[PDB]
Amino acid sequence: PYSSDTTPCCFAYIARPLPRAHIKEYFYTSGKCSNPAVVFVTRKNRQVCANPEKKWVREYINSLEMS
Numbered sequence: 805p806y807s808s809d810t811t812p813c814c815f816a817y818i819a820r821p822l823p824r825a826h827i828k829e830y831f832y833t834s835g836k837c838s839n840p841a842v843v844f845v846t847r848k849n850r851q852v853c854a855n856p857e858k859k860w861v862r863e864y865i866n867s868l869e870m871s
């Protein structure tokens with residue numbers, strides 16, 4: 805019933821923590837996707853899928869939220 809634009813989903817999670825200093829932004833993928841995910845945006849503007857349940861991921865989010 806709703807948006808007919810594509811939206812990004814994640815089908816795998818990066819296995820090891822990204823360097824924190826290379827990440828500038830994050831977002832969660834749509835709740836419509838089959839998997840929950842954090843996407844980190846790097847300073848080279850790459851987008852990397854990550855597991856929201858991982859400690860390092862939650863730590864990075866808190867840090868990013870902690871401007």
Ligand SMILES: *C(=O)CNOCCCCC
Binds near residue numbers: 805806
């Ligand atoms: C709202 O329009 C929902 N529609 O679902 C159709 C099933 C696949 C949509 C891509």
